[model samples]
Target: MQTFVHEAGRLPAHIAAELGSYRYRVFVEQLKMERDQYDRDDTVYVLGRDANGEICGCARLLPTTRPYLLQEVFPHLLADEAPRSAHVWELSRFAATAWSVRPMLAAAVECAARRGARQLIGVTFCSMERMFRRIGVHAHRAGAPVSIDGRMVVACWIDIDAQTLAALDLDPALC
Candidate 1:
């Protein structure tokens, strides 16, 4: 397994777009997204490849210095003020086309921490928070989960650690 990390402007646009297209869409027809959706500031795109070298999964790390999805678009999901910090990063656009994505998830967390992010601010669900806690990382619910687009969304701050990744044995990039 190999993890391809890149800044927003440095990623291979077409391959990144293809991996992003599997965001649990209707699948009946091709889903064409707004082109500008891929553009961002202080954003890092994490792409993971399987043994065959095909892009299997992806996650995005966004710095809070700019307008992130939760801070700019979904403020209502937060309990209070959105966090602002140079050491904090936001994780979103997390989707995987592969059957198992633990390695991808681990890579994202590890990458964020190594890149100077102490916590990953984003949205998650109750069950997911619980699962995160089980793996030795703190999962704080900034707000309660709400139904949006037929999916449960909850604002969260995910505490990340390189040590925790080792404990869970999920960072394939480290392996």
Candidate 2:
């Protein structure tokens, strides 16, 4: 599949329709609340498309200034004051139907940086923590893993500044 990214406001009709019923239902339906997690102007939603232009994956980034869903819906998972008004961007609801999770994650990180984000955050499933680490994000067990419908979850974070990108040898131009 040929991968490409598009902003939330610019998503095509077909992609929108696909996301509506995608296997990860919560990711699509709970977006507004997720957007509230960051600065409205800085929030960005992205859909990954293949050569056929079908949306095979999706993700959203919320600035630190905004309140994250985890903070509002799962305050028990929060530690001290959440990072706010910082250059941080919280990542949420990443799902893909036909691509490797790692590359898709890399693309999502690049997308966030291109939009001027300096950091990224996420609440990940325990089973996937290793993958999040491989992507170069620093994660802390802020809370005991919580089971959502049987899946174990934990909090995670990443910095997406020029220095971090340089360490990854990733082209900032891709952002």
Candidate 3:
């Protein structure tokens, strides 16, 4: 398997197709999140491809100092005011077909680290908390979980630093 992270404009044709299908199947079609794909040019994409060059897993990493998903879409789920920082980022559309969770996470952390981000904030369901811990990134819950489509979703934050990179066994490779 090959692991890579790229901005929207550079995704390979097949990899882009697989990511779109997977994300749509989970976030839109299954989870009923009621969203459509947006400008890829503005978002960074992480991909895990098989030897056959198929995208087995993927994630999105978006950097901003303004309101993101937790602040804009799910503010009710947060316990307090959402953070605003130049080094803080928000990641969403984190669904994958394979158990490439570790690699996908590594890509997210490394990508953020390369960009000088101090933390990554996102939302995930209850069951995934253990997966986040297993990877050695202790996600601080930003608020209580809110029910979405019959499941519990909670805001989370993960600090990005050299200690975390060593813990996740990743080397920073900034784009």
Candidate 4:
């Protein structure tokens, strides 16, 4: 598998189209979730491709300094005001096919660290929380879990540092 990280504008046109279609399938078609209006040029996208060179895993990184999913849509899940700092980021639209989760997560963390993020915030469902734990990625809950649109959702925060990289068995230099 190969991973690539690109800001919205610099993302290849074909890859961008593929990402959209993939998101449509994962978020809209399959998850029955509504799409939002928060994709910005500054948003970073982490992509994973398989041996066939087809994108199979992806995650979106959004700086909390700007409008993001947590701030714009899931604020109710937050205990305090939505974070708005360069050191904090939001992860969203994350999806992976079988055996792709770990690599995509490493890529996302590496990409976020490169951007000087100290923590990554995300709104995830209960089942995904179990998935994170199963993968050795422990994150802290930022708020109480609540039912939303038929799913149990909660906000979480993961530190972006050497310890996290080590836990992922990723070389610190990769950040």
Candidate 5:
């Protein structure tokens, strides 16, 4: 599989449409769950595709300097004031097929690190904490988990640096 990263505005029109459809499939059409709601102009998207060029995973990165999911939509998940800095980024709209998870995450890290980010944060189901362990990536909760819409969710933060990438077995130079 190959990973592609692009700023939302610079994303090719067709790929942007493909990403929207993929989001719908994972979060709405299939599981049945936003556009302007969280898709800021500065958002960056990371996509994973298979040998046949079919999209297999996707995630978005938003600089914390602007409005972000944990700050705007789920502030209650934070244990302290939300982060608002150029070095911190928020990852959201993350979705991936079983096998694509790790690759997508690495790509997200690469994208963030390439842009000078020091860390990545997101509001996610508490169960994802377990997933991070299985994936061999470190993610720490910013606050206690809370039940929201029947699901236990919390804010998580993952540092983006050479040491962290080395643990994932990803090339530190890629970031």
Candidate 6:
């Protein structure tokens, strides 16, 4: 599969449409809110495609300092301790159209690690937390899961420091 990250305005129409639907269903429709209610700055929406150029999955990132629904709408999930720095990033709005979630996340994680980010955070639903943990990243419940189309979600994080990332058998230079 060929996974890539694109800037907001540069995304193609089809991919953008898919991503928007995923986001609206996962975050807006599921959570019962409008898209503008979530933080947009520092957000990077990533798309993953197969060898045939079909999109398989999508994920997003928000800088720790940015104001996101996780902080404002679900404060209970976050720890009282502040994040390490502005360099920390929150991963949200992850979805897969073809069951290629693992590669999709690895691509995003590697991309962020290469950019010098120290850590990555995510709010995942139910068993999806285990998937993140399998990647060697830590998972935690920052708050109670709000019903998103009947799915439950909890907050999680992955330390992307040089050592942890290297331990994941990923090469930073290639991202």
Q: Which predicted model would earn the best lDDT?
A: 4
> Which residue window of length 10 is worst by lDDT in model 6?
32-41
Task: Write model 6 residue lDDT over 147-170, tens digit each, in one string.
Answer: 565667776667765554554557
Candidate 3 structure quality by residue, lDDT tens digits, 1-175: 5788886475676666667776767666766122344324567888777888877777777765754666677777778877777788887777655246777888888887777788888887766666777767757788887788788878887777655676577774331
Each model's number of backbone clashes?
A: 0, 4, 0, 0, 0, 2
- Misplaced by over 4 Å in model 2 are 8-13, 23-43, 135-142, 161-169, 172-175
Candidate 3 accuracy as TM-score: 0.82
Candidate order (lDDT): 4, 5, 3, 1, 6, 2
Give RMSD to native, each candidate.
Answer: 4.2, 4.8, 3.4, 2.5, 2.4, 4.2
Give candidate 3's error at residue 155 in angstroms. 0.2
What are the runs in model 4 whose C-alpha is more than 4 Å off? Answer: 8-10, 32-35, 173-175
| Per-residue lDDT of model 1, residues 40-70, tens digit only | 6456877777788876666778778777878
How far in Å is the alpha carbon of 60 misplaced in model 2?
1.5
The 0-to-1 C-alpha lDDT of every candidate, in the order given, reads 0.67, 0.61, 0.71, 0.80, 0.79, 0.64
Q: Which ten residues in a row have the lowest lDDT in candidate 4?
A: 32-41
- Candidate number with the higher lDDT (5 or 6): 5
**Number of the top TM-score candidate:** 4
* Model 1 TM-score (2 dp): 0.76
Cα-based lDDT at residue 21, candidate 6: 64
Kindly report which residue pairs in candidate 1 clash with one another: none
TM-score to native of every candidate shown: 0.76, 0.70, 0.82, 0.89, 0.88, 0.72
